[PDB]
JSON list of C-alpha atoms in Angstrom, two decimals:
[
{"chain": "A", "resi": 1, "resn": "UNK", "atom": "CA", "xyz": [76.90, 108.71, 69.72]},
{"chain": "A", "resi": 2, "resn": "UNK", "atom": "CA", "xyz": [78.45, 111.32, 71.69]},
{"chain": "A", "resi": 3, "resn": "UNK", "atom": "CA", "xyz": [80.96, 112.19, 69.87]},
{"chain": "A", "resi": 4, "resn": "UNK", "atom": "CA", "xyz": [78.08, 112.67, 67.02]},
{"chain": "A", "resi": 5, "resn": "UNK", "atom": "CA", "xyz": [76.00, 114.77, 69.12]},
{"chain": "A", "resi": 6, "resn": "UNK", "atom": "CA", "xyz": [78.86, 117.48, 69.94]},
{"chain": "A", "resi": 7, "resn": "UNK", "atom": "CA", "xyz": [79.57, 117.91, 66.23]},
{"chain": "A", "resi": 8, "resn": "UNK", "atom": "CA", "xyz": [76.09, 118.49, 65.81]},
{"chain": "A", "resi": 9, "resn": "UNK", "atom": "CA", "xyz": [75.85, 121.30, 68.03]},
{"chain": "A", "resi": 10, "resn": "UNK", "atom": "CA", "xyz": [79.29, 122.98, 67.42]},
{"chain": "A", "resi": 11, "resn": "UNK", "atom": "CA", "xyz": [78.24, 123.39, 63.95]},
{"chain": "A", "resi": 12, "resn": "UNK", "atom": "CA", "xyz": [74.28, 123.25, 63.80]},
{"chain": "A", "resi": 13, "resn": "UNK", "atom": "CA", "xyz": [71.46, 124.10, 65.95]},
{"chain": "A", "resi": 14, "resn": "UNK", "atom": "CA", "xyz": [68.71, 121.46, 66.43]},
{"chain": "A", "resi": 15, "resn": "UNK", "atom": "CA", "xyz": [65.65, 122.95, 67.68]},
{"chain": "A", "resi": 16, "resn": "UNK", "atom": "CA", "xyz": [68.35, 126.09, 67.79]},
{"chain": "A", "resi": 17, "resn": "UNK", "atom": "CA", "xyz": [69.34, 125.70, 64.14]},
{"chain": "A", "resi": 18, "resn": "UNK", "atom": "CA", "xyz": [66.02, 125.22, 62.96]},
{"chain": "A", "resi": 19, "resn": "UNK", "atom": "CA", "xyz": [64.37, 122.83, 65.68]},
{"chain": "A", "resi": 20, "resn": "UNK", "atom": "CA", "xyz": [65.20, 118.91, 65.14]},
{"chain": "A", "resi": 21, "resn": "UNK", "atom": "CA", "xyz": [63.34, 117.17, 62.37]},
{"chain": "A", "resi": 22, "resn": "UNK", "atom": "CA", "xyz": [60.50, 115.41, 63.79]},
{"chain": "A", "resi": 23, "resn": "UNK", "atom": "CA", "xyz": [62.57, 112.35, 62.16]},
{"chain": "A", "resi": 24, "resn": "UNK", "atom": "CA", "xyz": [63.47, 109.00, 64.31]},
{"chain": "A", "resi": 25, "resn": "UNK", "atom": "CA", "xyz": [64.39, 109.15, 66.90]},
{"chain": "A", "resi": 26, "resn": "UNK", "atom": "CA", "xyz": [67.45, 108.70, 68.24]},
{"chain": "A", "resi": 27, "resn": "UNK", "atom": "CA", "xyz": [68.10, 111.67, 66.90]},
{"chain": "A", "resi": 28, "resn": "UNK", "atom": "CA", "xyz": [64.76, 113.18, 69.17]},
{"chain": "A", "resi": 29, "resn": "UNK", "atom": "CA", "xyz": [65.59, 110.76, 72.26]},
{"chain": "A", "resi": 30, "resn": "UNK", "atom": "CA", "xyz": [68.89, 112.76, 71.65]},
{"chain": "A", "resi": 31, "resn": "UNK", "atom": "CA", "xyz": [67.08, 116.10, 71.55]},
{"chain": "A", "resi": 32, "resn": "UNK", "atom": "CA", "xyz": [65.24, 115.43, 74.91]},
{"chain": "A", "resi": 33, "resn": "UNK", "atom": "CA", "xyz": [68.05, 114.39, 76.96]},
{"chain": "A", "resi": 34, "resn": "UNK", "atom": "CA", "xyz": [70.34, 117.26, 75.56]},
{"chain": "A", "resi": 35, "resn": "UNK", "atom": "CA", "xyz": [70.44, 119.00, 78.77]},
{"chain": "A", "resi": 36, "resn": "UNK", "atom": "CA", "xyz": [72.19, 117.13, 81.83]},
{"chain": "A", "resi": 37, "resn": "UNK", "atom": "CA", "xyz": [74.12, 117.81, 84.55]},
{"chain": "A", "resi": 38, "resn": "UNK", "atom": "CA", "xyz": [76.81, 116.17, 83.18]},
{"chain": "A", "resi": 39, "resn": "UNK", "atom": "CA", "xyz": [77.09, 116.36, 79.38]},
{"chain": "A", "resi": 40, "resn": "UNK", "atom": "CA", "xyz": [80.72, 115.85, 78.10]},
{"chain": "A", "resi": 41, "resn": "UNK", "atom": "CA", "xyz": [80.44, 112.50, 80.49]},
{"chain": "A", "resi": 42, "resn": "UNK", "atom": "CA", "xyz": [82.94, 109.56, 78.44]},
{"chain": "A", "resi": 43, "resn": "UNK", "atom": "CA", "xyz": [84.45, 111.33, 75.22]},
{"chain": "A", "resi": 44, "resn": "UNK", "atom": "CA", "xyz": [87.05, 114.36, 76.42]},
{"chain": "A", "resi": 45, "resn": "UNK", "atom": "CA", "xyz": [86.13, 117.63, 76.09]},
{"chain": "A", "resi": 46, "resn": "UNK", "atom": "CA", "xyz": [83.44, 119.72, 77.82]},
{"chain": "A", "resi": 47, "resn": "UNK", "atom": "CA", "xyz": [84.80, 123.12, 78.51]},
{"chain": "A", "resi": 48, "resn": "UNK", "atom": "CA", "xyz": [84.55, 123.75, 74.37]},
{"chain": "A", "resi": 49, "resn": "UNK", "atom": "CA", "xyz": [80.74, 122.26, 75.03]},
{"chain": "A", "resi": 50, "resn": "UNK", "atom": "CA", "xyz": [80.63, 125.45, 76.91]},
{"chain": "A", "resi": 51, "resn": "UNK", "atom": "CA", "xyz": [82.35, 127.30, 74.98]},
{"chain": "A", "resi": 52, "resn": "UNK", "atom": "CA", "xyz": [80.13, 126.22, 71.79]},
{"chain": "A", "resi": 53, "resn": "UNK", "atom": "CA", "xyz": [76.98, 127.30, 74.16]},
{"chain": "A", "resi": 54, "resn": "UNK", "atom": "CA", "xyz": [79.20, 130.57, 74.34]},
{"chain": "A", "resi": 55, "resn": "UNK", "atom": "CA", "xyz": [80.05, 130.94, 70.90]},
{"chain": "A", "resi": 56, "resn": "UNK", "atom": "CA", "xyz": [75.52, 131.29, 70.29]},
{"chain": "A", "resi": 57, "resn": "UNK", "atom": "CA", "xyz": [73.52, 133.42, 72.44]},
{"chain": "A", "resi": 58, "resn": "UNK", "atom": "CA", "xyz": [75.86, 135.34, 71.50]},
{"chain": "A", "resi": 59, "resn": "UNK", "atom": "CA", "xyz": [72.18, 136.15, 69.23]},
{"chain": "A", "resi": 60, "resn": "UNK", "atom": "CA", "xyz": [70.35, 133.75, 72.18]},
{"chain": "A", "resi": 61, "resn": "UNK", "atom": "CA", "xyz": [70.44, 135.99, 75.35]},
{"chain": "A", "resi": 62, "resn": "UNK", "atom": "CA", "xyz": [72.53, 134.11, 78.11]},
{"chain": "A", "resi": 63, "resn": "UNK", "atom": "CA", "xyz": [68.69, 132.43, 79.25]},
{"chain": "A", "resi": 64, "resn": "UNK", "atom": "CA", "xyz": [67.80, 129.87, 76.25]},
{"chain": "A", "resi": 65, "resn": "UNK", "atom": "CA", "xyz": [71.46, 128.99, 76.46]},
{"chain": "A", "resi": 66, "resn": "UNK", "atom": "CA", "xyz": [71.16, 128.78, 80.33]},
{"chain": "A", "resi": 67, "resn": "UNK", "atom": "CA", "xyz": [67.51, 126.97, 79.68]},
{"chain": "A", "resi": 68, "resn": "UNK", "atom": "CA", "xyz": [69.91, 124.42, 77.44]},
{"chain": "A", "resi": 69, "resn": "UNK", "atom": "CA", "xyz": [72.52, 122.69, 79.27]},
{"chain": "A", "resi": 70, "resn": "UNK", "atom": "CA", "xyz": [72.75, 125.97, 81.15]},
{"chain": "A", "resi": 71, "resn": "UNK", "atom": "CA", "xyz": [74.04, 125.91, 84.39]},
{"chain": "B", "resi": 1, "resn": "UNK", "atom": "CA", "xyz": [67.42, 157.29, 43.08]},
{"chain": "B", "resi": 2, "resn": "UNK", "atom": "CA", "xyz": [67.67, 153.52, 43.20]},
{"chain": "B", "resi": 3, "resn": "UNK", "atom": "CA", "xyz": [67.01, 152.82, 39.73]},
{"chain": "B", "resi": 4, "resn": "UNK", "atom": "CA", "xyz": [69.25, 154.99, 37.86]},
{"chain": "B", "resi": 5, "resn": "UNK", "atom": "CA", "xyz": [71.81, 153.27, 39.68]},
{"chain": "B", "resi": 6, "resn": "UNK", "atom": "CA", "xyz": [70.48, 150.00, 38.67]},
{"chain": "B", "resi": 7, "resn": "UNK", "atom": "CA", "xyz": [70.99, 151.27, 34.99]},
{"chain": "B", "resi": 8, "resn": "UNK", "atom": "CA", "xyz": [74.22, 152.50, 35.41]},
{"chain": "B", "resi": 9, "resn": "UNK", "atom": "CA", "xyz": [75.38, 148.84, 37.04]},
{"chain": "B", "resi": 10, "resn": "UNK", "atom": "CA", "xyz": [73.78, 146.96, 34.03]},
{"chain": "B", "resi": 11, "resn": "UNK", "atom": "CA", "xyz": [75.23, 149.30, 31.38]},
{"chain": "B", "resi": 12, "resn": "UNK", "atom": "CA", "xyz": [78.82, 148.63, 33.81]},
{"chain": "B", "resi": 13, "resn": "UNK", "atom": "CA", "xyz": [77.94, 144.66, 33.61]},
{"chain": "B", "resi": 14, "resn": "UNK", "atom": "CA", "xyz": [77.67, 145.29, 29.66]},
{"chain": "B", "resi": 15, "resn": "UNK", "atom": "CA", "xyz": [81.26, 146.69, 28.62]},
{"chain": "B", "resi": 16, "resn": "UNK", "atom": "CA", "xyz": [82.86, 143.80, 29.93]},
{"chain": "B", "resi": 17, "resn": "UNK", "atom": "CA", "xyz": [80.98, 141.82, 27.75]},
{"chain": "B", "resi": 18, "resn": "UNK", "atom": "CA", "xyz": [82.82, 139.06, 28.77]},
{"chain": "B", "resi": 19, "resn": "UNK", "atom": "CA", "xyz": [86.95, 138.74, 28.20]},
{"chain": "B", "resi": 20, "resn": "UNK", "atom": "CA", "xyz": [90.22, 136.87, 28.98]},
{"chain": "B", "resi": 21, "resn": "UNK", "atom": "CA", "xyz": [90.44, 135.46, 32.22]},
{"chain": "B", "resi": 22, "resn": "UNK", "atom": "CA", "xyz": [93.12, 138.50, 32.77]},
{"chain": "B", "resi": 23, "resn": "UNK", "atom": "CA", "xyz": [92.18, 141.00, 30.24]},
{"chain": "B", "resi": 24, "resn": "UNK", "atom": "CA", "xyz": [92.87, 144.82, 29.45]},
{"chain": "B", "resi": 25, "resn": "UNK", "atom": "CA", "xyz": [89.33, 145.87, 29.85]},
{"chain": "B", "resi": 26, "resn": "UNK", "atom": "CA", "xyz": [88.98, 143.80, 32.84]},
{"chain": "B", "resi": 27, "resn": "UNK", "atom": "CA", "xyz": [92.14, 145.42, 34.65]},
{"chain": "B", "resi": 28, "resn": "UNK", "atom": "CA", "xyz": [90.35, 148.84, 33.81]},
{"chain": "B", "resi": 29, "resn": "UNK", "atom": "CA", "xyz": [87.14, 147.90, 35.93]},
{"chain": "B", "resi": 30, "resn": "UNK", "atom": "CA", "xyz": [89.55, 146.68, 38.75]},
{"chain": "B", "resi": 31, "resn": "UNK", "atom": "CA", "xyz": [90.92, 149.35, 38.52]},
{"chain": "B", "resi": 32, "resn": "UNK", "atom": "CA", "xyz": [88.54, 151.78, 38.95]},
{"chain": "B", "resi": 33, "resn": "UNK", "atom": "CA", "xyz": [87.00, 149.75, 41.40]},
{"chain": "B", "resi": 34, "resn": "UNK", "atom": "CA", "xyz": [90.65, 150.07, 43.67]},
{"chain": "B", "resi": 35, "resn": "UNK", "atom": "CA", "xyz": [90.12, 153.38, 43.03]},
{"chain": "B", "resi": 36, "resn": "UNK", "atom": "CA", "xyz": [86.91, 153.38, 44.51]},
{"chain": "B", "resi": 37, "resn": "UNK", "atom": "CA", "xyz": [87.39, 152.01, 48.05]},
{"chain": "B", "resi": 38, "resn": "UNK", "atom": "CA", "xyz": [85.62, 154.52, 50.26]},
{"chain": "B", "resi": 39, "resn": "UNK", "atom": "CA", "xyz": [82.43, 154.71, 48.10]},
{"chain": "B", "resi": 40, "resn": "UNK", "atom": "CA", "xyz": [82.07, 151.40, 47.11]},
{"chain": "B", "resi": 41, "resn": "UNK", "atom": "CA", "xyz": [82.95, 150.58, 50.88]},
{"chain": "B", "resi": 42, "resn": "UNK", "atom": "CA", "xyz": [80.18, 152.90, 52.05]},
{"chain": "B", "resi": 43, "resn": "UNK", "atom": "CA", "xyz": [77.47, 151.82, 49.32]},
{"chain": "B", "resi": 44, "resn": "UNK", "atom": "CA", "xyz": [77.91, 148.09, 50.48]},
{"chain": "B", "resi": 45, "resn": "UNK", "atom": "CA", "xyz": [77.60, 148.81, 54.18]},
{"chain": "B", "resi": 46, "resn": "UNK", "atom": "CA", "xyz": [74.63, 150.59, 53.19]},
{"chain": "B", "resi": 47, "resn": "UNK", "atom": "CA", "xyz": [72.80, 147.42, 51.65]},
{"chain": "B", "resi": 48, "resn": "UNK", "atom": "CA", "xyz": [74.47, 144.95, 54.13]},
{"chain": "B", "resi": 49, "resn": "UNK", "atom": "CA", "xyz": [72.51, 147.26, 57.31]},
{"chain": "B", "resi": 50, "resn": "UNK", "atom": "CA", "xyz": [69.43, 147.20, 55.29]},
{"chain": "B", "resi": 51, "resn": "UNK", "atom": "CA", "xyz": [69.43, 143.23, 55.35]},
{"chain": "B", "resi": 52, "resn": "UNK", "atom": "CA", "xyz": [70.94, 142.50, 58.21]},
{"chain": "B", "resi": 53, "resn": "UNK", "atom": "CA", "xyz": [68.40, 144.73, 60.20]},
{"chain": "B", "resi": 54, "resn": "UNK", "atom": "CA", "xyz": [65.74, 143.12, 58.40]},
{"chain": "B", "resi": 55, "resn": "UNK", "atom": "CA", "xyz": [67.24, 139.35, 59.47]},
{"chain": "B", "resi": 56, "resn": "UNK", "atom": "CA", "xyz": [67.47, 140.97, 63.03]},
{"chain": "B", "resi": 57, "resn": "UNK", "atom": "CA", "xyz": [63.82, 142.04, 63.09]},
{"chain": "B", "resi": 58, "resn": "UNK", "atom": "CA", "xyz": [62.88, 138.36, 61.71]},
{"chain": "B", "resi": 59, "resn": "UNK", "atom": "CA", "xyz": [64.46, 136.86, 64.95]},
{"chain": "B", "resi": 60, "resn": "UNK", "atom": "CA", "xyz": [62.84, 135.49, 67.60]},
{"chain": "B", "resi": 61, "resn": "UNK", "atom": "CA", "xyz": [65.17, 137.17, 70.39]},
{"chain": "B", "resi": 62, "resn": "UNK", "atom": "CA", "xyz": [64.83, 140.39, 69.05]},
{"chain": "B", "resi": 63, "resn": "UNK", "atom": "CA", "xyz": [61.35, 140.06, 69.08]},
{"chain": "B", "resi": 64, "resn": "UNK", "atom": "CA", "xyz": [61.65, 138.87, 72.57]},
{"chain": "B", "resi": 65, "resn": "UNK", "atom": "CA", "xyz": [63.62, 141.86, 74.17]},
{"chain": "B", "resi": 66, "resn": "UNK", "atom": "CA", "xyz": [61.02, 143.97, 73.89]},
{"chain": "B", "resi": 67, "resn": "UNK", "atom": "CA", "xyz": [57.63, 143.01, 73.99]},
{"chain": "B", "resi": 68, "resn": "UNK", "atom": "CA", "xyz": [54.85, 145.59, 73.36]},
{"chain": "B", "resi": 69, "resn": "UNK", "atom": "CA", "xyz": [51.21, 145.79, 73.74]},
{"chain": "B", "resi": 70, "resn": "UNK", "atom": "CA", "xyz": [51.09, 147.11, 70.07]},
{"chain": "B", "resi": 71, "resn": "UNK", "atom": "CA", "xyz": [54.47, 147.41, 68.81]},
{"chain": "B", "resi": 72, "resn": "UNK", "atom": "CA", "xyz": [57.47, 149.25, 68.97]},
{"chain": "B", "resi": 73, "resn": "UNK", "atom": "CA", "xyz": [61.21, 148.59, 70.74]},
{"chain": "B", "resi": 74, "resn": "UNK", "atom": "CA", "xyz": [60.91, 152.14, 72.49]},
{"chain": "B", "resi": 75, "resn": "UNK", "atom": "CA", "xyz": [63.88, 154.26, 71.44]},
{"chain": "B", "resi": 76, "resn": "UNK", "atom": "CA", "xyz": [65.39, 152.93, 74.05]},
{"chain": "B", "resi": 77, "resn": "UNK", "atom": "CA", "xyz": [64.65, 150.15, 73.95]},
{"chain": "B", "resi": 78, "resn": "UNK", "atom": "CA", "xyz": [65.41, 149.23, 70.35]},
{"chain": "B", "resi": 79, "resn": "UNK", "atom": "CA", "xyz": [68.67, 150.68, 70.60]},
{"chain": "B", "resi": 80, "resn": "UNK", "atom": "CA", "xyz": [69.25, 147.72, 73.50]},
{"chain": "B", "resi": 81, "resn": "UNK", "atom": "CA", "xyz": [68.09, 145.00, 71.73]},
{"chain": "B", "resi": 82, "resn": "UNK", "atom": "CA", "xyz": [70.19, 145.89, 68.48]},
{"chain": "B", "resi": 83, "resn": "UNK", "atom": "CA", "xyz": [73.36, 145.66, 71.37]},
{"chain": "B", "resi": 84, "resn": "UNK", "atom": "CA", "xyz": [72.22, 142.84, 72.50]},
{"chain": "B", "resi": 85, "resn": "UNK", "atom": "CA", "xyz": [72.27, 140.86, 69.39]},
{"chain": "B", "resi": 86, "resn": "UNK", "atom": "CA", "xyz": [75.87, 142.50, 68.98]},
{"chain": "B", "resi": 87, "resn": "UNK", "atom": "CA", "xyz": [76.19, 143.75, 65.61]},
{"chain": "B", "resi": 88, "resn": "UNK", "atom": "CA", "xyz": [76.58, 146.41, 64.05]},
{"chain": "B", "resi": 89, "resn": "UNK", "atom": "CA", "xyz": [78.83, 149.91, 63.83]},
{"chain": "B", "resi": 90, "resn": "UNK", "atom": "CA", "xyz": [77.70, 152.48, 66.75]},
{"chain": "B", "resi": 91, "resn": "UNK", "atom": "CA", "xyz": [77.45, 155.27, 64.76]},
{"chain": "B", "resi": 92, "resn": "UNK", "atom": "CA", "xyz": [75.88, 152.67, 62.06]},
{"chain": "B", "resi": 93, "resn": "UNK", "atom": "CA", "xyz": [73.60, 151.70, 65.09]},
{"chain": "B", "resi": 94, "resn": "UNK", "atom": "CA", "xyz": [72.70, 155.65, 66.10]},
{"chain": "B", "resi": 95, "resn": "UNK", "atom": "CA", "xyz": [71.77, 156.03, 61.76]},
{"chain": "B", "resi": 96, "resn": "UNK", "atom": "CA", "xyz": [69.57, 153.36, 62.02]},
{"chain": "B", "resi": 97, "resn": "UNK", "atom": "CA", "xyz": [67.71, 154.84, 64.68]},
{"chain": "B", "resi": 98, "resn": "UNK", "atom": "CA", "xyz": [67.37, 157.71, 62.50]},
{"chain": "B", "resi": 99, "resn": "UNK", "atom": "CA", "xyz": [66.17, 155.90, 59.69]},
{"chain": "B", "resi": 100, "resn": "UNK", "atom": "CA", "xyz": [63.51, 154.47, 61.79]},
{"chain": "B", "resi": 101, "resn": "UNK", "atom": "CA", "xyz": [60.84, 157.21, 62.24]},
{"chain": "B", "resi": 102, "resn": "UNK", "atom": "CA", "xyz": [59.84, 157.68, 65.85]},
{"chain": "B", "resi": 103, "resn": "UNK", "atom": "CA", "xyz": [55.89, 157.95, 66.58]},
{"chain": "B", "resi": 104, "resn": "UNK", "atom": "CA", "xyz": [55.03, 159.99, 69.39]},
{"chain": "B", "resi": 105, "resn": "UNK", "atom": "CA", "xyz": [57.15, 157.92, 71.64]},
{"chain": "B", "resi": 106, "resn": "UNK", "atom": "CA", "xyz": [59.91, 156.07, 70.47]},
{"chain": "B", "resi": 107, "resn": "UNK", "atom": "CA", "xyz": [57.43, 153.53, 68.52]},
{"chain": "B", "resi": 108, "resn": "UNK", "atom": "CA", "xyz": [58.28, 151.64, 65.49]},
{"chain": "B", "resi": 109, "resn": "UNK", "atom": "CA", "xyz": [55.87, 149.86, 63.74]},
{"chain": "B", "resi": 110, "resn": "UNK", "atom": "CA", "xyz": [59.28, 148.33, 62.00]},
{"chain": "B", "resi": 111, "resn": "UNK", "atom": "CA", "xyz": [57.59, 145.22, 59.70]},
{"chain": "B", "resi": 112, "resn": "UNK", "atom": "CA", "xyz": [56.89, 148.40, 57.82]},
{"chain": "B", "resi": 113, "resn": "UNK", "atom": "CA", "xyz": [60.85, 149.23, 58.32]},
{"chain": "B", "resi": 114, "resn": "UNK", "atom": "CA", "xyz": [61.79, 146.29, 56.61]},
{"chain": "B", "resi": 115, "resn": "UNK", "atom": "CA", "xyz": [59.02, 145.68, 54.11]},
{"chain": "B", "resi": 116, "resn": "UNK", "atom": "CA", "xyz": [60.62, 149.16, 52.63]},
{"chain": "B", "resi": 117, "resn": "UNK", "atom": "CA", "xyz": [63.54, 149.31, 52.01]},
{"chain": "B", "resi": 118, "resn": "UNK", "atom": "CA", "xyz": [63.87, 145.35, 51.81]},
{"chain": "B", "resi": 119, "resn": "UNK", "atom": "CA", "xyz": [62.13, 145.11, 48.15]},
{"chain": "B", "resi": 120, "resn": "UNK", "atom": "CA", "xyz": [63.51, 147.67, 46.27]},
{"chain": "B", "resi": 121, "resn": "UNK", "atom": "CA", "xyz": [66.88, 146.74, 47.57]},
{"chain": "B", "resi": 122, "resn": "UNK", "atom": "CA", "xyz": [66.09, 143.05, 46.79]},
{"chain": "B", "resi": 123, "resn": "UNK", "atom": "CA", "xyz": [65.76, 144.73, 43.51]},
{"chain": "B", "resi": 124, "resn": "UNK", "atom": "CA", "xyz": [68.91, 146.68, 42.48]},
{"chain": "B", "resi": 125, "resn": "UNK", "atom": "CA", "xyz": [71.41, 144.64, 45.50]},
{"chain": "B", "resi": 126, "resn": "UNK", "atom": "CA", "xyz": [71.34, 141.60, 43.18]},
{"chain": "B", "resi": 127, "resn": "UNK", "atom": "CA", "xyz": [72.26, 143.10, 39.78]},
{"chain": "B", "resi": 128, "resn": "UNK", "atom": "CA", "xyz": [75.47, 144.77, 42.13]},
{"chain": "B", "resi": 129, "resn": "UNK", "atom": "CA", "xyz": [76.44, 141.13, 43.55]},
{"chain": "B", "resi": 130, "resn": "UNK", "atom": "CA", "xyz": [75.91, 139.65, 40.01]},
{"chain": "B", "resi": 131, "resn": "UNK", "atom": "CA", "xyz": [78.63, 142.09, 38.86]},
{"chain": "B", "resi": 132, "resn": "UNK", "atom": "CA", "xyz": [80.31, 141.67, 41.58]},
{"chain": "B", "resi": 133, "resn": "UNK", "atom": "CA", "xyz": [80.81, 138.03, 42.08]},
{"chain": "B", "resi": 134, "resn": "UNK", "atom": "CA", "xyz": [81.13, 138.10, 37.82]},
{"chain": "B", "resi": 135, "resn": "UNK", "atom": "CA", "xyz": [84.12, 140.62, 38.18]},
{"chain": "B", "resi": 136, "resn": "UNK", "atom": "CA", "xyz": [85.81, 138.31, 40.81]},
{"chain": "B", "resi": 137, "resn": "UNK", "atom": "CA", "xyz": [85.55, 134.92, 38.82]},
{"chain": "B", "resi": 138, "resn": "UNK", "atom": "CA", "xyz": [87.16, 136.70, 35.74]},
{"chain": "B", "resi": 139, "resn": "UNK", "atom": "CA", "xyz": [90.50, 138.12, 37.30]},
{"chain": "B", "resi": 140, "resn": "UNK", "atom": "CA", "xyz": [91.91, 136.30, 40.60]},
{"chain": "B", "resi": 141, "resn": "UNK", "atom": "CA", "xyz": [94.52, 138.09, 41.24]},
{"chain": "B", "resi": 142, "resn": "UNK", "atom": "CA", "xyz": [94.79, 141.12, 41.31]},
{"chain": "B", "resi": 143, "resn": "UNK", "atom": "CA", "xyz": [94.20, 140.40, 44.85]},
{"chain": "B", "resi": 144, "resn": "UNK", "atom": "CA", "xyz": [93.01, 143.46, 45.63]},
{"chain": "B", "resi": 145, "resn": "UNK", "atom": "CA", "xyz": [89.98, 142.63, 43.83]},
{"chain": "B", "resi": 146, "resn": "UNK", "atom": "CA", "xyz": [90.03, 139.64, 45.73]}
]
């Protein structure tokens, strides 16, 4: 599931692409816990996670991608 | 201005009139086209800063950088949030400053800015990507077509 959710939002914005479909469920459970302290927790990788957040915002102002995962 | 060129594209699109994948007529166009760099190169900039401006002033952060009681991104102000979304030639940016007209103060009423140009280009811009896009299915190479 992990794994699923980083491909996502490499490639795709949710709410950012064009907010997440209000579609099961899951994908929104997903959506809500998005930000944590600890994201890239059990799959490798993380630094690109920020690097991704980099990559947008970037046309998003450092703040919604601070607001995001942030930190 | 915009719709003689129009006619001069379509009557372009029509001597082709269709051809061998590589054909004598077609290396002609290329041709001229190669020959044609700067202008061509300058005409397409033109239409890709009219709709990328527009898709800039249809974003949310843009709209966001500078809020307004009634409008406007103040010269200044503008010019910052254009930077901030990152985009665009500086001298390009500085000429679209000067397209916008200032009010009094550096206001822009701007929907206005993209409702104009935005549908006359939406007129003539897809007759020159149609002969485009047609030119580059027809002959790959020459690359520099390509």
């Amino acid at each position: 599931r992990e794994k699923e959710l980083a491909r996502k939002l490499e490639f795709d914005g949710l709410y950012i692409t064009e907010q997440p479909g209000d579609d099961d469920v899951k994908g929104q459970w997903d959506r809500l816990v998005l930000n944590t302290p600890s994201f890239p927790s059990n799959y490798w990788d993380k630094f690109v996670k920020r690097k991704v957040l980099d990559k947008h915002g970037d046309i998003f102002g450092r703040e919604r991608i601070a607001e995001l995962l942030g930190m | 201005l915009l719709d003689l060129q129009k006619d001069m594209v379509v009557m372009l699109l029509s001597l082709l009139e269709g051809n061998v994948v590589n054909g004598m007529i077609a290396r002609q166009m290329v041709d001229m086209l190669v020959e044609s760099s700067s202008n061509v190169e300058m005409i397409l900039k033109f239409f890709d800063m009219f709709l990328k401006l527009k898709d800039i002033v249809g974003s949310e952060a843009f709209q966001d950088y500078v809020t307004d009681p009634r409008g406007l991104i103040s010269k200044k102000d503008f010019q910052k949030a254009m930077d901030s979304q990152k985009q665009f030639t500086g001298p390009e940016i500085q000429f679209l400053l000067s397209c916008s007209e200032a009010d009094e103060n550096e206001m822009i009423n701007f929907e206005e800015f993209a409702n104009r140009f935005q549908e006359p280009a939406r007129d003539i811009g897809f007759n020159v990507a149609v002969l485009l896009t047609n030119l580059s299915e027809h002959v790959p190479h020459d690359p520099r077509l390509r």
